[PDB]
């Protein structure tokens with residue numbers, strides 16, 4: 135294999151992963167006028183002070199920064215969630231140009247990119263078990279628009295030349311993901327899925343309303359990555375986003391008025 139191209143992209147994924155046509159697929163369009171403010175939703179608790187980043191990896195579909203998830207060091211709680219969710223990794227989706235790249239949309243607006251911080255529910259013990267449960271994962275989604283640089287992203291940007299092609303990884307210690315967060319933790323939430331194969335319907339989505347700004351130079355560096363492995367014909371890693379999927383009567387809830 136799956137990818138993002140004509141012959142292996144999102145419109146093909148259902149053949150290997152029939153849940154692609156399921157009842158709670160992601161991403162979705164967030165219709166801001168229809169999302170209901172839910173005064174019972176709690177503030178989101180993001181505790182990243184003790185995060186331990188390990189590696190940065192080009193997996194042929196994105197790049198990811200991986201964390202030590204063997205203890206409760208970087209956890210998401212509160213908001214719509216019951217219990218504690220450990221940060222495993224973050225990665226991005228982005229476009230070939232600034233007018234596309236996000237997976238979620240807001241009133242049909244596409245952002246230039248979308249950051250996903252993937253967490254798993256500690257009551258299932260490991261991520262592989264969590265992916266088999268309807269409340270197994272919590273993904274914090276953050277939109278990126280192009281304007282001013284995000285200083286906390288620069289450390290990531292600057293090592294991407296060392297992981298150009300599928301396969302490649304590098305040490306990436308002491309990275310603080312707090313530097314990627316917007317001011318506000320106001321959010322929308324809904325029950326959904328992974329947005330890449332296996333498309334498992336295991337995710338509570340928490341999508342922040344406030345985008346972060348990144349510079350054109352920062353996103354340009356994303357666009358120099360390659361989908362291909364070294365030695366294979368060069369295919370820029372761009373447009374690695376799944377389009378919005380049918381909502382199927384799910385309710386999107388807002389934490390804010």
Ligand SMILES: [N]S(=O)(=O)[C]C1234B567B89%10B%11%12%13B85%14B%1158B%12%11%15B%139%12B%1061B%12%112C5%153B%14874
Pocket residue numbers: 250252273327328329330331332
């Ligand atoms: N856009 S997404 O659904 O967060 C991608 C991932 B992260 B890892 B494993 B974890 B699960 B599979 B692998 B990357 B693909 C799915 B989730």
Ligand SMILES: [Zn+2]
Pocket residue numbers: 225226227250329
């Ligand atoms: Zn993702």
